[PDB]
């Protein structure tokens, strides 16, 4: 009788029978393999640009298509379409709201999107010949706060809020397609595969769920962290992905081997990790912390290959282009800088 | 050099001057933030503050000066990841009710909610103001059940002057930092002028202290 306690014990039973089956398989560590690797050297790199146009905080950035155009957001309700060669600004977009959490740019080059605390993901057009800046659509299906949203094409978008869920909308119809329920903590960020078939979601319950796009069900759920998770980026092949947390430990998960591989511990300052980024071909994981720094970890050595200069406030967003020639750092003192 | 860059820098400068002349208009005006509790008193105090989903602003005016009230309670999520986005504000309103002591630990929940905002690492400069609503409704509460229901550590009389002062005394002794900010307290009323005017004066004092933060006279 009273089999609900037995159903609760089935969770720990299936955990110990399935998730704790990594003792005779997860044997290869990254010290026997990474002994005969070569380092990358002390990276001496300096700021080439300093985009002094904003007047508020910047924690939202996404690149263009041909590695040319930047999208930036301020806390005055202002989007700026920056250029990365001549320090040019092209489109200044006033917003209905004022507090912007994230922004995104289209993989083709036409549309932008931004959202914040008003639970409205506003998608705007840039290629309109009639009133160059105008409102295309305003999606609204969340009751918390929009945290991170990225495009798939010019007809769909993947948004995520603090309602312990994430959704896939539709620009052509205006409604939603599916809703990925089954999450416990607050969803913070997401990244997606370059072939756009699998996306990894963030959490505040120290998990990194790999979801599915087409079928609408969860695929994998990870663990390993002891705090919240602020930023997740995806490896340019499809094997691994990095996760940044609030305990100064940036971990590198895995999907094929299904085992945590490498930890990044900064023994000097134990502040959080609020931005991660990969390079073009690996071996340079960029990480923007909360201690006014931007460090360069190695993907196999896990030692810092040089540091970057900071700002008057914390570096809150990173970015590496499609080719791998521009690092962009965005802090809260309106100094969106472009390094080497 | 500068084939069409002489026309490109013109567009680069026009909507950069526009950013400055639109940011000054939003930076010269004063902003007032509004915390509270769960549907405690944030509907009565906004009856005068009306006019000239997520969060919605309230843009009213008084003595030819526009205020912007920023509500909080519409967000059904945690506070640890977006309370830093609401900094730079001048005055934080933390509206507290009085007749919710009997229902359940509601006043005991508001004390640790007031504790988390007075010791926040981002709000170490903005002074906080707390209201105490239901002034006439609390006067009849004492004769049935006193304030000493769940307080074995304090003794007192059953008068209205002792009950209203101890709630003001218990809230004020919660902040660990006392040098920078100063907690303000005003009992509400059923009138229209005196309900907000002190708040008016309160914002005045903050900017005077802010000027003493600017000249170094503090």
């Amino acid at each position, epitope marked *: 009788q009273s089999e609900l306690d037995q159903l609760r014990q089935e969770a720990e039973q299936l955990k110990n029978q399935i998730r704790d089956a990594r003792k005779a398989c997860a044997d290869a560590t990254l010290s026997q393999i990474t002994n005969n690797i070569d380092p990358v050297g002390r990276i001496q790199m300096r700021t080439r640009r300093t985009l002094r146009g904003h007047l508020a905080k910047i924690y939202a950035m996404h690149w263009g298509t041909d590695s040319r155009l930047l999208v930036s957001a301020s806390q005055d309700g202002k989007l700026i379409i920056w*250029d990365s060669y001549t320090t*040019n600004k*092209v489109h200044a977009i006033p917003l209905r709201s004022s507090w912007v959490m994230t922004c995104a740019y289209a993989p083709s080059g036409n549309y932008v999107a931004c959202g914040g605390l008003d639970n409205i993901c506003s998608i705007y057009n840039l290629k309109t*010949r*009639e*009133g*160059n800046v105008r409102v295309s659509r305003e999606l609204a299906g969340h009751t918390g706060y929009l945290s991170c949203c990225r495009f798939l094409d010019d007809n769909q978008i993947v948004t995520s809020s603090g309602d312990t869920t994430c959704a896939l909308w539709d620009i052509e119809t205006g409604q939603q397609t599916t809703t990925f329920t089954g999450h416990t903590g607050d969803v913070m960020s997401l990244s997606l595969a370059p072939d756009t078939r699998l996306f990894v979601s963030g959490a505040c319950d120290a998990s990194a769920k790999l979801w599915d796009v087409r079928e609408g069900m969860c695929r994998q759920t990870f663990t390993g962290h002891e705090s919240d998770i602020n930023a997740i980026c995806f490896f340019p092949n499809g094997n691994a992905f990095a996760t940044g947390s609030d305990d100064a430990t940036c971990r590198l998960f895995d999907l094929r081997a299904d085992q945590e591989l490498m930890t990044y511990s900064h023994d000097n300052i134990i502040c959080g990790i609020t931005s991660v980024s990969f390079s073009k071909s690996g071996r340079l994981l960029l990480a923007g912390y909360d201690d006014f720094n931007c460090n360069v970890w190695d993907a196999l050595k896990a030692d810092r290959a040089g540091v970057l200069a900071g700002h008057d406030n914390r570096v809150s967003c990173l970015g590496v282009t499609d080719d791998g020639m521009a690092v962009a750092t965005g802090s809260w003192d309106s100094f969106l800088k472009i390094w080497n | 050099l500068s*084939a*069409e860059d002489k026309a490109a820098v*013109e567009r680069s400068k026009m909507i950069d001057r526009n950013l400055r002349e639109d940011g000054e208009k939003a930076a010269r005006e004063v902003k007032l933030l509004l915390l509270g509790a769960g549907e405690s008193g944030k509907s009565t105090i906004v009856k005068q503050m009306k006019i000239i989903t997520g969060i919605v602003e309230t843009h009213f005016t008084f003595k030819d000066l526009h205020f912007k009230m920023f509500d909080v309670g519409g967000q059904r999520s945690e506070r640890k990841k977006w309370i830093h986005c609401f900094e730079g504000v001048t005055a934080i309103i933390f509206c507290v009710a009085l007749s919710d002591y009997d229902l359940v630990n509601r006043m005991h929940e508001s004390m640790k909610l007031f504790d988390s905002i007075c010791n926040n690492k981002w709000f170490t400069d903005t002074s906080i103001i707390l209201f105490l609503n239901k002034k006439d409704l609390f006067e009849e509460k004492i004769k049935k059940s006193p304030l000493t229901i769940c307080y074995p550590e304090y003794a007192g009389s059953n008068t209205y002057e002792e009950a209203a002062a101890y709630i003001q005394c218990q809230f004020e002794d919660l902040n660990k930092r006392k040098d920078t900010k100063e907690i303000y307290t005003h009992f509400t009323c059923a009138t229209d002028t005196k309900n907000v005017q002190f708040v008016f004066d309160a914002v005045t004092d903050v900017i005077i202290k802010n000027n003493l933060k600017d000249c170094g006279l503090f």
Partner: single-chain antibody, 233 residues
Framework: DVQLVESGGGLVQPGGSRKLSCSASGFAFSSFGMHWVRQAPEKGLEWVAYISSGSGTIYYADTVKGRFTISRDDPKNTLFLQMTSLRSEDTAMYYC??????????????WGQGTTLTVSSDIVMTQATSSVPVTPGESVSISCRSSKSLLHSNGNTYLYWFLQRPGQSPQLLIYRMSNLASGVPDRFSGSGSGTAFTLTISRLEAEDVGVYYCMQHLEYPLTFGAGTKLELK
């Protein structure tokens, strides 16, 4: 969907002074600079003046300066052109033009009706010869060769291909030598290098015949050629 409103008048003796107006509707008029394009009845296009968006840049040509004045009214959404000391060789068809200049833009993308006014060392461009027999299915190679090298190491090459349909206003085909304008089919595959240029028009259909212009926009003023039209025979 947008509309451009103009007016008209009578013939003016040489020695007059008038004012022309161009009104706009359907888009924001403040964020577009304004050109004046003057078309002689001998098919040759030429440029008069340009005003910028922030009213801080006014450009004229060599034989244009002094007697002409341009102004604009943004709450009224109008463009005024005051012409003084008119002659018998500077009265022609006119066109008021919107144009915006940024990265990924289309200058000279939509023109207007304009006005009619009658009486009674630049960069050398080559346009020859305006008689090419085409059929619905025959390709064409329009010759437009420049003298100054347009390779700025920028690397935008500023040549503009325009089509003039018979009876109405001309429209843009190709901007910055390799792009495609909005509302233009993909038959106008143009390319080139430095000095040489080639406009390949394959799988032709007898619905877009007209006069093909090539315009050179590296330095001011706007240099032109003579014109290149096709024929059915």
């Amino acid at each position: 969907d947008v509309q451009l409103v103009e007016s008209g008048g009578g013939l003016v003796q040489p020695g007059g002074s008038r004012k022309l107006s161009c009104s706009a509707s359907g888009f924001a008029f403040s964020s577009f600079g304004m050109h004046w394009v003057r078309q002689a009845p001998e098919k040759g296009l030429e440029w008069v003046a340009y005003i910028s968006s922030g009213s801080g840049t006014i450009y004229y040509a060599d034989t244009v300066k002094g007697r002409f004045t341009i102004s604009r009214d943004d709450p009224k959404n109008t463009l005024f052109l005051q012409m003084t000391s008119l002659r018998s060789e500077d009265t022609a068809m006119y066109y008021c033009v919107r144009s915006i200049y940024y990265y990924g833009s289309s200058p000279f993308d939509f023109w207007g009706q304009g006005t009619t006014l009658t009486v009674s060392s630049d960069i050398v461009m080559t346009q020859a010869t305006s008689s090419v027999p085409v059929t619905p299915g025959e390709s064409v190679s329009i010759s437009c060769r420049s003298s100054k090298s347009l390779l700025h190491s920028n690397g935008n090459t500023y040549l503009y291909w325009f089509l003039q349909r018979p009876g109405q206003s001309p429209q843009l085909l190709i901007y910055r030598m390799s792009n495609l304008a909005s509302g233009v089919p993909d038959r106008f595959s143009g390319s080139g290098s430095g000095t040489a240029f080639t406009l390949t028009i394959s799988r032709l259909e007898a619905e877009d015949v007209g006069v093909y212009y090539c315009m050179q926009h590296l330095e001011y003023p706007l240099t032109f050629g003579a014109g290149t039209k096709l024929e059915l025979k």
